[PDB]
Amino acid sequence: MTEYKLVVVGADGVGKSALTIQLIQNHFVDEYDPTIEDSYRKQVVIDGETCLLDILDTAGQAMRDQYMRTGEGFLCVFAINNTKSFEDIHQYREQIKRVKDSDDVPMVLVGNKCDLAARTVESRQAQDLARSYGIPYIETSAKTRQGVEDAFYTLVREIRQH
Ligand SMILES: Nc1nc2c(ncn2[C@@H]2O[C@H](COP(=O)(O)OP(=O)(O)CP(=O)(O)O)[C@@H](O)[C@H]2O)c(=O)[nH]1
Ligand SMILES: CN(C)Cc1[nH]c2ccccc2c1[C@H]1NC(=O)c2ccc(O)cc21
Ligand SMILES: [Mg+2]
Ligand SMILES: [Mg+2]
């Protein structure tokens, strides 16, 4: 079966761990346990083919270059009530682009915490950013599970079709 190396990147507290744990274990982590780094594996059927996902759940915090070289696709997560995390996406893409030496790297822009009210980043702002990069934009909630499978399986598809 085909193996996919996915990397979940993004600023502190955006929900990188909650999204990964929701896809792997089907439950929401309510507490905030800051991540050093964890990796999870899951065997799933995507478009009739059995896939092995190896997902790297990174720290929001120089030591990011090693996983960017190995990573095949990147879930670039920001929280829709965290303007700085959305702005930080530009820096993550520039670093990934530099390490991979390529303008066409599989990525999906994810606006997490879509269950929360009073958003500070509009969907239109994130759609415009994703359009400038040529990548999909998907909103998610690790709390309700909305869009979680869609975000990861859209990224698997982006890698498979690269
Ligand atoms: N309302 C809501 N809260 C969420 C959502 N996803 C994560 N959270 C909350 O945000 C906080 C941080 O989530 P966490 O998954 O640890 O984020 P992270 O980006 O992995 C944190 P670090 O960067 O330190 O690893 C937690 O309290 C968690 O429950 C979401 O979709 N909705
Ligand atoms: C092999 N797996 C059990 C772990 C794992 N899953 C991944 C998914 C995407 C990208 C990288 C990885 C890795 C590691 N392989 C690396 O090259 C690397 C660099 C820095 C790290 O922190 C971790 C890894
Ligand atoms: Mg985390
Ligand atoms: Mg504006």
Q: Which CATH number do you get for residue 147?
A: 3.40.50.300
Sign of the torsion formed by the C-alpha atoms of 24, 126, 132 and 96: negative
Contact 138, 147 (CB under 8 A): yes
Strands 2-10 and 107-112: unpaired
What φ, ψ does residue 69 adopt, rounded to 5°?
Answer: -70, -45
Residue to substitute in 5, 72, 99, 107 for testing ligand 2 pocket (most ligand atoms within 8 angstroms of CB): 5
Three-class SS of residue 51?
strand
Nearest atom, ligand 1, residue 116 CA: 1
Q: Residues whose CB is under 5 A from ligand 3 (ion)?
A: 16-17, 35
Looking at all shown ligands, the one closest to residue 31's CA atom is 1
Q: Residue 110's beta-bridge partner residues?
A: 77, 138
Ligand nearest to the CA of 87: 4
* Tally of domains within the chain: 1
Q: Is 101 a known ligand-binding residue?
A: no
Task: Tell me which residue of 111, 81, 76 sits closest to 94, measured CA to CA.
Answer: 76
SS3 43: strand
Q: What is the domain extent for residue 21?
A: 2-161
Residue 1 near residue 50 (C-beta atoms within 8 A): yes
Q: Say how many Å lie between the CA of residue 125 and the centre of ligand 4.
A: 7
**Cα-to-centroid distance, 29 and ligand 4 (Å):** 32
For residues 8 and 68, what is the distance between their CA atoms, to the nearest angstrom? Answer: 10
Instruction: Give CA angle at 68 (62, 72), nearest 5°.
Output: 175
Both tokens assigned to 135: 């990548």
15 annotated ligand binder? yes
109: β partners? 76, 137
Q: Is 60 annotated as a binding residue?
A: yes
Reduced to 3 states (helix: H, G, I; strand: E, B; else coil), residue 92 is: helix
